[PDB]
């Protein structure tokens, strides 16, 4: 009927209630609630977080008209495993492969410390020979085999993340690693060539790489928005708060493009005085940090041995609202670089990318298995 996804982020818990249309999703209600209950993408104070999630589920339950009781929880690429696996189910009759055989054969893969959370198909193989993308309505005589991609997350995260959302009085129908979700924000062309999604939130920066249409591998960095603000507060000798504002109001991640005529005033933290800075001044600190962030990204890529990103670079997430971000990355790499923002209205901010893709993934599996 209705699709409701929940994004439990370090800056704000995000919720989206949507409806499936022929050419996409129709957001009919959203909610957002800032919280200090989540840090580095994990629950820092259960109670505080459990209250943020409820508030978010409410603000949306109101704005959407729907009375939310079921939700799809996204999971951060943290303590996550992305590997290859296959499985085959047998037949004793002439069976017309339907959505239920897909699930049955995938379930086997969903099989110690971790737990398979997502199993997605790469290619199926009917009666031990017909290699095909879709095996539906095709007739199987002896067997249906699937070579899939699998994602596992550490049991500690899964459990508590769900214990917290379910403590709000709603059921978690399913879970979706952002490592799978980002596939949505891409284009078929990007997925094919080898695109790299860079989601810079507040505490975490997630990196996902897709090639030939499927996810290849993923990881995260504990450096993001907050660190930009931290760098700003120290550089202008000011409070975190005012630092978090001038970043929003005047932030520019590329030095060579920040204004001088643009001036603002920040108060000092050690005196009852006030200093005046230009946008460019602020830029020095911002670019520096956003750069160190991309340098981390590259390393993640090297570790995962995922060089070559002919698919290009896609950057998103809250910090993606920063000006000059596209400029800076393009200046330190040689592939296309775009800042993905949800198309649907109401959620036309980079920070909503993950939440909306969670719904996409939901719907995607809904069809695959029916
Ligand atoms: N307009 C702005 N300019 C630059 N940065 C901003 C702006 N708006 C949002 N941010 C920053 O983006 C970050 C939050 O965005 P985001 O929602 O993607 O993080 P989160 O998902 O809630 O937590 P997580 O780090 O676990 O992903 C904050 O650090 C915030 O300061
Ligand atoms: Mg986030």
From Swiss-Prot:
Record bears the keyword Cell division: yes
Superkingdom, natural source: Bacteria
Alphabetical GO biological process terms: FtsZ-dependent cytokinesis
Function of the protein: Cell division protein that is involved in the assembly of the Z ring. May serve as a membrane anchor for the Z ring.
Family: Belongs to the FtsA/MreB family.
Subunit record text: Self-interacts. Interacts with FtsZ.
Protein's UniProt name: Cell division protein FtsA
Source species of the chain: Staphylococcus aureus (strain MRSA252)
Range covered out of full length: 4 to 377 of 468
